[PDB]
Amino acid sequence: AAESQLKRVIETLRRLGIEEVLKLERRDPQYRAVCNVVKRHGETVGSRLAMLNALISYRLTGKGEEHWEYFGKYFSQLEVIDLCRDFLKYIETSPFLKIGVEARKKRALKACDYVPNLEDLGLTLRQLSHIVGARREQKTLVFTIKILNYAYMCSRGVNRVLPFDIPIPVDYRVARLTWCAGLIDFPPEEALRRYEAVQKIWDAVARETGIPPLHLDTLLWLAGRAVLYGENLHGVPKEVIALFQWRGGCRPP
């Protein structure tokens, strides 16, 4: 089943080009928040704020979307002076960051002075892995690279396709979608533990479709909104949504 589902996924996602994915990224509320902050604060400060927000985008109790919207509103309308201090204050203030707030502050503090290199995202990922103390493939780090690409694209007014060798950010949602598409036969909880196995599947999809993993992430966001949450944004077509409804209860309420 897993082999035939992988083929179906590839041959369906082949109907979409990388240029269409890049266009969809402009619609992502994460992109919009980042871009609003970069326009307000410039590339260097805005990219650092977006980076720090991405680094602490975990244990959000289902509020990731609201959290990015709040980030964008908070910093788009506020002067930033001492970036580290201002970020730490934001962590304390946010309605969305209350779980483990002290450890969020400590992680942000580790990265507070770090200036990402937006034109060498591979070196940036390696540096972040040392700063944060995580494997390069860990969800929050690869997600941070995606967010940094959003900041770069917005700042420079360009498209830039991410590397194939940076894997997809595997959170419980992505694990659930992978299971819902019949690509794994072990449950989402186990998949999340074994997140590299999930990444390997999406790396095969990436290679065969021409859509790098961090861009496949965009498609999974849209498909997930439709299938898990019942919010059809019409960013992906009906046949893409249907991929993720292979298993019985993979349906909106």
Curated annotation (Swiss-Prot):
Chain intervals for the UniProt region annotation (Helix-hairpin-helix): 124-183
Effect annotated for changing residue 146 to Q: Great decrease in activity and thermostability
UniProt-listed InterPro entries: AGOG, AGOG-like, DNA_glycosylase, HhH_base_excis_C
The entry's keywords: DNA damage, DNA excision, DNA repair, Hydrolase, Lyase
Listed GO biological process terms: base-excision repair
Pfam families in the record: AGOG
GO molecular-function terms, A-Z: class I DNA-(apurinic or apyrimidinic site) endonuclease activity; oxidized base lesion DNA N-glycosylase activity
Claim: Lyase is one of the keywords in the record: yes
Temperature dependence: Highly thermostable. No decrease in activity was observed after heating 15 minutes at 80 degrees Celsius.
EC number annotated for this UniProt entry: 3.2.2.-, 4.2.99.18
Residues annotated as catalytic: 139, 171
Residues reported to bind 8-oxoguanine: 30, 57, 68, 143, 169, 217, 221
Coiled-coil ranges from the UniProt annotation: none
Reactions performed catalytically: 2'-deoxyribonucleotide-(2'-deoxyribose 5'-phosphate)-2'-deoxyribonucleotide-DNA = a 3'-end 2'-deoxyribonucleotide-(2,3-dehydro-2,3-deoxyribose 5'-phosphate)-DNA + a 5'-end 5'-phospho-2'-deoxyribonucleoside-DNA + H(+)
Family under the similarity heading: Belongs to the archaeal N-glycosylase/DNA lyase (AGOG) family.
Protein task: DNA repair enzyme that is part of the base excision repair (BER) pathway; protects from oxidative damage by removing the major product of DNA oxidation, 8-oxoguanine (GO), from single- and double-stranded DNA substrates.
Domain writeup: Contains two alpha-helical subdomains, with the 8-oxoguanine binding site located in a cleft at their interface. Contains a helix-hairpin-helix (HhH) structural motif and a Gly/Pro-rich sequence followed by a conserved Asp (HhH-GPD motif).
Protein name in UniProt: N-glycosylase/DNA lyase
Protein species of origin: Pyrobaculum aerophilum (strain ATCC 51768 / DSM 7523 / JCM 9630 / CIP 104966 / NBRC 100827 / IM2)
Lineage, opening ranks: Archaea, Thermoproteota, Thermoprotei, Thermoproteales, Thermoproteaceae
